[PDB]
Write a protein that binds this ligand. Structure first.
Ligand SMILES: *[C@@H]1O[C@H](CO)[C@@H](O[C@@H]2O[C@H](CO)[C@@H](O)[C@H](O)[C@H]2NC(C)=O)[C@H](O)[C@H]1NC(C)=O
Ligand SMILES: *[C@@H]1O[C@H](CO)[C@@H](O)[C@H](O)[C@H]1NC(C)=O
Ligand SMILES: *[C@@H]1O[C@H](CO)[C@@H](O)[C@H](O)[C@H]1NC(C)=O
Ligand SMILES: *[C@@H]1O[C@H](CO)[C@@H](O)[C@H](O)[C@H]1NC(C)=O
Ligand SMILES: *[C@@H]1O[C@H](CO)[C@@H](O)[C@H](O)[C@H]1NC(C)=O
Ligand SMILES: *[C@@H]1O[C@H](CO)[C@@H](O)[C@H](O)[C@H]1NC(C)=O
Ligand SMILES: *[C@@H]1O[C@H](CO)[C@@H](O)[C@H](O)[C@H]1NC(C)=O
Ligand SMILES: *[C@@H]1O[C@H](CO)[C@@H](O)[C@H](O)[C@H]1NC(C)=O
Ligand SMILES: *[C@@H]1O[C@H](CO)[C@@H](O)[C@H](O)[C@H]1NC(C)=O
Ligand SMILES: *[C@@H]1O[C@H](CO)[C@@H](O)[C@H](O)[C@H]1NC(C)=O
Ligand SMILES: *[C@@H]1O[C@H](CO)[C@@H](O)[C@H](O)[C@H]1NC(C)=O
Ligand SMILES: *[C@@H]1O[C@H](CO)[C@@H](O)[C@H](O)[C@H]1NC(C)=O
Ligand SMILES: *[C@@H]1O[C@H](CO)[C@@H](O)[C@H](O)[C@H]1NC(C)=O
Ligand SMILES: *[C@@H]1O[C@H](CO)[C@@H](O)[C@H](O)[C@H]1NC(C)=O
Ligand SMILES: *[C@@H]1O[C@H](CO)[C@@H](O)[C@H](O)[C@H]1NC(C)=O
Ligand SMILES: *[C@@H]1O[C@H](CO)[C@@H](O)[C@H](O)[C@H]1NC(C)=O
Ligand SMILES: *[C@@H]1O[C@H](CO)[C@@H](O)[C@H](O)[C@H]1NC(C)=O
Lengths: 453, 134, 134, 134, 48
């Protein structure tokens, strides 16, 4: 009465993990920065993003078991490694540096930590050697015991200088799906992160994502939809991080005010080292301003979404960081080339009543600067940031948060959400939560009435 | 109705059969142009789009060893078994998706390929050879 | 007459149709043997001969989605449109090259593929399914 | 009887013809998964399994240019030549292996491909075009 | 052997029963990790 029949090209997908592509955004030829982040290899963007909504399709997404985040993490790591491979190495810089405090410690109650170091470096030739100076900045040893000093970067790993021609400005990079596979994108405004998406669309290329390395605060991220989102792999477990996505962007303006200069001292037959020159003009610490009204409103909007998980008409608190690594306890990011480590101790001093909290036009945050970074998971290499000639001012949208809850028997009392971070993957789950990779299996069978021969 | 790529994933199997070329044409050619010569990053995506065509050719070998061969709709001579999805007609093609269909068949799907590769061309070809001489 | 590979590029389309296998056999297998293991120079030519087979498989998918499927000469059921090259028979096959032909068709060539992929198998297959039960 | 892959290498050609799908299914998919990204060792095996599919596609082009096209048993219209293996029927299919067969044909094997590619589709297609108008 | 008559060609021998062998370095040794360069570290044979 009825026989089996094959059908090729049926809408059947199975969730799997494979290698993805990457987009060139199409403005790469007009940037002409020689090499940005992924301007190296990615292909230009299609003229029309094929975004096709699939009606009557509900698909179970799980952002915490996703494999796109691992792909993007390994890609960023290999990006760092292949960008720093052909640049200038600075292994002869690990010498002894007789340093001196800056000539302006006016009012020693306030801090001033830049060391006018001088040292005998190797020159163009190998026979002679020349004495240079001006390494500066806080990161250094306290010497073994004009005071002697050396580099703790040398106490850890080898050092290489970042190429001065390349840039660190994040270009919009959106991953694309290869042949045979597709990317399901959730579309409803409120998404639990783990669960069935009722409004699903399909694409090959995703939406533009800027690779930003940041802690405690997500910068230049994608805004949420109408509501602030509180995502977590397991809200009961304290050890698991708490990701927060904002509805309205928080304005932040960071400034390195030191109208700085550079010195190109020649070392080796081809290499050339860029040293931080003398500070022309007055000196003061780098900082970051955030409008106090916007931050107040953002906190008052996030607390109500947190009360949905931890009780109505209850109090929550959040102090500053606990302690540990400098990259974990401080909002660390990059701007213009200089790496800012700011302390958010001035933003998290709050207790919340059921209706209010317990002028000042803006809140300023001090910020130290670091040029040598051991953020690489390969503890065999470290990068020297080349000095930026001039004043630095960079604006940004704050869009997310990473929080950790204090464990213990704090049920009857209140809960604390101290800032944290560390894992780079948490920075990517705020952008790839709505995306899942699926493979197409177009071979189906079904019974119909027909006969051959 | 078209509704583009995978538009009928939640529609009936009959309505989904109206868009076979749509799902077929976008799986094989997701062509990336790899003219820039970048060292370690090309091998991963190259392996990806090579395993893609390997899987595609595995599917094509499976669709060639059977009596079916046209990359389209096709009928066979293997009877449907009442043990596999005890359902009548129009109950399948008008209140079921291909996802749930493959889910219910997944328990008995593995022997159907064998019944299509052996009970057909291992005997249909031999009958074709012994019935083409007259 | 053979005249080897591409020998009839300037001859008539009828005479050029006599050498289809000649142009077909030399495009797919320009086989280079890459047994020596040389680092950065292999990826370029490997990408080249992989994009070659990708383009070949794109052409094969286009020639499979149509009612035609044999890698040979083939006839369809889509009528020729008088708007496309207002010319009679023997005027085309005896005083025209395939180059100038594709040049004149290039203005209207893009819709012919759609008329061959949709007006045919999106209806010919469905008619085959609804006329094979009796 | 199956006897697995290449089981009938020393059996008769008739018994060996009973296991064509067995030798066909294990040559194309010896799939290695190359998810680990290892520098200089991947290019060699990648070249290997790419030349594998290149040879496979050469064989498929040879089996497509002929009147045969189904990846199965098939008959042609080129007569067997008495100069090639002066033997009767049942003498070949019941006391000979495919190895010794190809060995004896290797002296005259090179012209048979030409007789199959030219004496067939270079005239069979043309007869098909000039006999399909009525 | 590739050619038993030729002397220059080696003679390979494969056993039926395995011959037990026990090798020992008895020096209860130690190591020293002396730091050299900014990242490298050399492992030297310590005192016996
Ligand atoms: C960050 O910088 C921007 C631009 O410098 C500031 O925006 C300005 O705000 C002032 C005061 O409200 C206005 O008078 C200007 O017209 C604004 N300019 C632009 C271009 O928008 C912003 O206020 C700064 N934010 C903080 C927290 O300092
Ligand atoms: C001067 O340098 C010494 C170096 O040991 C440091 O301890 C001290 O705090 C510095 N004083 C300043 C920066 O006023
Ligand atoms: C520098 O720091 C020292 C303390 O180490 C302090 O006594 C001195 O006043 C500061 N300023 C100058 C100009 O030395
Ligand atoms: C740093 O010391 C050098 C001497 O090596 C001197 O020429 C230079 O002016 C000093 N800079 C400052 C800011 O004190
Ligand atoms: C979201 O998913 C988690 C998974 O554990 C579940 O417990 C929770 O009820 C879901 N909904 C909300 C609003 O969190
Ligand atoms: C920074 O200093 C240089 C050198 O004194 C000066 O020419 C320049 O104008 C300064 N920057 C600004 C923004 O004025
Ligand atoms: C946090 O604030 C306290 C003072 O309230 C301060 O002593 C501490 O250094 C700050 N930072 C950390 C990481 O605790
Ligand atoms: C922040 O909002 C609270 C609640 O209205 C208010 O008490 C406090 O004064 C605000 N802080 C400002 C305006 O700096
Ligand atoms: C974010 O975007 C702004 C554009 O205003 C840019 O200046 C900045 O470098 C970007 N990155 C960060 C970390 O702020
Ligand atoms: C911040 O968000 C506003 C709101 O859409 C947008 O206009 C602006 O370009 C954003 N800036 C950055 C640096 O993302
Ligand atoms: C259906 O399958 C069962 C077990 O798989 C088998 O015993 C039976 O003979 C099959 N019937 C048909 C008609 O295929
Ligand atoms: C579709 O509806 C029929 C009758 O209402 C029911 O028997 C059948 O199980 C339904 N299909 C599915 C997949 O549940
Ligand atoms: C020919 O093409 C024109 C426009 O492309 C169209 O209006 C007309 O119906 C076509 N006629 C045939 C016979 O295909
Ligand atoms: C071939 O000749 C005919 C008649 O001489 C003419 O109408 C036609 O246009 C010619 N072909 C071309 C391509 O010019
Ligand atoms: C057989 O081959 C010989 C030489 O190859 C040729 O002369 C003869 O015509 C052929 N006969 C047939 C029937 O093919
Ligand atoms: C098989 O046997 C027949 C008759 O015994 C003989 O003529 C023939 O040569 C044999 N086959 C082979 C390959 O020797
Ligand atoms: C090797 O020497 C160490 C140090 O004296 C000792 O602790 C250890 O027990 C010795 N090895 C054995 C097997 O006793």
């Amino acid at each position: 009465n009825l026989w089996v029949t094959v059908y090729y090209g049926v809408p059947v997908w199975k969730d799997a993990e494979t290698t993805l592509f990457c987009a060139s955004d199409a403005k790469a030829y007009d940037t002409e920065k020689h090499n940005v982040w992924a301007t190296h290899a990615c292909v230009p963007t299609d003229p029309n993003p094929q975004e096709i909504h699939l009606e009557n399709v509900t698909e179970e997404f799980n952002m915490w078991k996703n494999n796109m985040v691992e792909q993007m993490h390994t890609d960023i790591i290999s990006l760092w490694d292949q960008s720093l491979k052909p640049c200038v190495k600075l292994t002869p810089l690990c010498v002894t540096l007789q340093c001196t405090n800056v000539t302006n410690n006016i009012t020693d109650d306030m801090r001033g930590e830049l060391k006018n170091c001088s040292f005998n470096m190797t020159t163009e030739l190998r026979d002679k050697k020349q004495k240079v100076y001006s390494l500066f900045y806080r990161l250094d040893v306290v010497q073994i015991n004009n005071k002697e000093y050396r580099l703790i970067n040398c106490n850890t790993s080898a050092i290489t200088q970042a190429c001065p021609k390349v840039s660190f400005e994040p270009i919009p990079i959106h991953y694309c799906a290869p042949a045979g596979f597709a990317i399901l994108k959730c579309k409803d405004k409120k998404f639990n992160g783990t669960g069935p998406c009722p409004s699903v669309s399909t694409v090959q290329c995703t939406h533009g994502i800027k690779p930003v390395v940041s802690t405690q605060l997500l910068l230049n991220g994608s805004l949420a939809e109408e509501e602030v989102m509180i995502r977590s792999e397991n809200i009961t477990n304290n050890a698991k991080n708490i990701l927060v996505q904002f509805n309205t962007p928080v304005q932040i303006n960071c400034t390195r005010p030191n109208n700085n200069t550079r010195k190109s001292i020649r070392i080796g037959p081809g290499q050339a080292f860029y040293a931080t020159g003398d500070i022309i003009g007055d000196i003061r610490q780098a900082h970051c301003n955030v409008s106090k009204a916007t931050w107040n409103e953002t906190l008052g909007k996030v607390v109500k979404q947190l009360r949905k998980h931890f009780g109505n008409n209850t109090i929550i608190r959040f102090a500053n960081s606990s302690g540990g690594d400098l990259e974990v306890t401080t909002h660390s990011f990059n701007c213009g080339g200089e790496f800012f480590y700011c302390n958010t101790s001035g933003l998290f001093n709050s207790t919340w009543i059921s209706n209010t909290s317990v002028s000042n036009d803006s809140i300023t945050l001090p910020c130290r600067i670091k040029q040598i970074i051991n953020m690489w998971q390969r503890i065999g290499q470290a990068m020297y940031a080349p000095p930026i000639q001039g004043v630095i001012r960079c604006v940004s949208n704050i869009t997310g948060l990473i929080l950790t809850r204090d464990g213990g028997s704090t049920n009857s009392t209140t809960e604390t959400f101290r800032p944290g971070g560390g894992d780079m993957r948490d920075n990517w789950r705020s952008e790839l939560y709505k995306y899942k990779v699926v493979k197409i299996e177009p071979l189906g069978v079904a019974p119909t009435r027909c006969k051959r021969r | 109705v078209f509704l583009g790529f995978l538009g009928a994933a939640g529609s009936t199997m009959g309505a989904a059969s109206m868009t076979l070329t749509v799902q077929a044409r976008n799986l094989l050619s997701g062509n990336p142009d790899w003219l820039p010569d970048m060292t370690v990053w090309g091998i991963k995506q190259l392996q990806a789009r090579v395993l893609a065509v390997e899987r595609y050719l595995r599917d094509q070998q499976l669709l060639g060893i059977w009596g079916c061969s046209g990359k389209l709709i096709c009928c066979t001579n293997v009877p449907w078994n009442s043990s596999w999805s005890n359902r009548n007609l129009s109950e399948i093609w008008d209140n079921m998706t291909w996802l749930q269909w493959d889910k219910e068949i997944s328990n008995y799907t593995q022997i159907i390929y064998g019944l299509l590769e052996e009970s057909q061309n291992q005997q249909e070809k031999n009958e074709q050879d012994l019935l083409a001489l007259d």
